[PDB]
Design a protein around this nucleic acid. Structure first.
Lengths: 50, 97, 136, 88
RNA sequence: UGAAAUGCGCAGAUACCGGGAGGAACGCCGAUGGCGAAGGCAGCCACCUGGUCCACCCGUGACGCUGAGGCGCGAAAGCGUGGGGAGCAAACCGGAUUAACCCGGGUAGUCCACGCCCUAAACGAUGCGCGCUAGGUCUCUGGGUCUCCUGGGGGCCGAAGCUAAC
């Protein structure tokens, strides 16, 4: 819902939208932090990425 | 009554028969814990962030039920006992994300 | 909790920052106080105001002429404002024990037996009260 | 997991009149309900000190709610303490 | 490690590749951050449960505030019982330097749970602590609104206090 409209930053299913580590992004990312972590437990390359 | 969400990953080498069996067992086991299947989706075969059982890929399943709060951890355990079940994930509120 | 002290305090911080007025909790015992300090000159006066149904006693801070030379901050009138007899440390005095304000230049609010009077108004009527506070 | 609907009952139960949702009796009533719930928690999570603190908070607050209704009107005070099973 | 000793020596090690068993600790995001009574806690998820903030503003009605005994409780630490494994590690052992704490191996031990115990803490915003009052700009956090306001943190002030931290 309240996620910049484009898409829920919680969407950890369709990881077709790359974005790991980072540090800037935008506004709050605490809810996004858990997202990435939730995806990594399923199928999100936890390698390194740059 | 707490609504949840489960993400199961079966063996990527199961036939339509064996695959159908697992689902019939998962949906069943859920009902045994007061879980009502509100919707099911079969994502398919993607790629794990880590090779489980020497398998870099697996078949993902999608479930959404509203089972008792004090019986969730009991289901996940009742599901991960299956040799086919590569892993299970549970969260909260409709679709998982 | 002391309503009076808290009030006389606002009056102080009001002059330090140099404000035109300051609102205070409306009260009978407080009204008389502000009334006296207005008859002397410590304050330009007060007025009743009901904020959203809540009564207050906003007072007008009075200031003297301009300083001796190029300098803003007008000359203050209330050089001090503390209380003597206060909760816990009740301090009462008699007509023959009446305190001494700052050499006449001021007034010692005394809650005598004849209404909130000063050091002289009490000495005259020959009545003692409670050392509310000394202003100068 | 409770505490969401049962409130209406507890409130309307100790409500001195239609519309009362905060009287001395109501406050203690609903507050006591919380203590009982919390009590049933510590017994399961004895290693939970934080909540244990909040327990004494409501218990200490509740007792204060009692002593008050006691010196102001020991009539309802004796009734509330009885309807709550408090020290029969 | 700048040296070297030590160790590796059933074998074929160490840095290679894949798999298996066990235990502990758990990166990037973690940030002048946040929460909580203190301690302490930061992979993630579900459940039980506490405290706190904000809004409209109905209700009961200052039933208040601080606070000595008492009760519970702090990092590391020692102590008793049951018990498995790993990392690190003071006493211990050795090389060297010298004429020592750096490096290597390393068991007892440190660990987890219960019980006993519970100091200097932190910090210096703590004599506690409450209410009111003065008060602008910039960056950051939360809610309802959106030149705002209530409630935090950091930086530079004005009045005033403290000369003796300027």
């Amino acid at each position: 819902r309240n996620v910049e409209v484009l898409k829920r930053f919680l969407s950890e299913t369709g990881k077709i939208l790359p974005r790991r580590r980072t540090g800037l992004s935008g506004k709050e990312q605490r809810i996004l932090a858990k997202t990435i972590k939730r995806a990594r437990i399923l199928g999100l390359l936890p390698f390194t990425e740059k | 009554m707490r609504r949840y969400e489960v993400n199961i990953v079966l063996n990527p080498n199961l036939d339509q028969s064996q695959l159908a069996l697992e689902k019939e067992i998962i949906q069943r086991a859920l009902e045994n814990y007061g879980a009502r299947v509100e919707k099911v989706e079969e994502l398919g075969l993607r790629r794990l962030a880590y090779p489980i059982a020497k398998d870099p890929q697996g078949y993902f399943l999608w479930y959404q039920v509203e089972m008792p709060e004090d019986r969730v951890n009991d289901l996940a355990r009742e599901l991960r006992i299956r040799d086919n079940v590569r892993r299970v994930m549970v969260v909260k509120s409709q679709e998982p994300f | 909790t002391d309503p009076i002290a808290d009030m006389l305090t606002r009056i102080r911080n009001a002059t330090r920052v140099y404000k035109e007025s300051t609102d205070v909790p409306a009260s009978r015992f407080k009204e008389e106080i502000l009334r006296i300090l207005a008859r002397e000159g410590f304050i330009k006066g007060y007025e009743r105001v009901d904020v959203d149904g809540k009564p207050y006693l906003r007072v007008y801070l009075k200031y003297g002429p301009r300083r001796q030379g190029p300098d803003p901050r007008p000359e203050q009138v209330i050089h001090h404002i503390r209380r003597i007899s206060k909760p816990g440390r009740r301090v009462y005095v008699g007509v023959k024990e009446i305190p001494r304000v700052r050499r006449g230049l001021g007034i010692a609010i005394l809650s005598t037996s004849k209404g909130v009077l000063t050091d002289r108004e009490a000495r005259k009527l020959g009545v003692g009260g409670e050392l509310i506070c000394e202003v100068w | 997991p409770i505490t969401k609907e049962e409130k209406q009952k507890v409130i309307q139960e100790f409500a001195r009149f239609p519309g009362d949702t905060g009287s001395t009796e109501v406050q203690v009533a609903l507050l006591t309900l919380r203590i009982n719930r919390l009590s049933e928690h510590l017994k399961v999570h004895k290693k939970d000190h934080h909540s244990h603190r909040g327990l004494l908070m409501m218990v200490g607050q509740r007792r204060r709610l009692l002593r008050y209704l006691q010196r102001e009107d020991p009539e309802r005070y004796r009734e509330i303490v009885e309807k709550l099973g408090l020290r029969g």
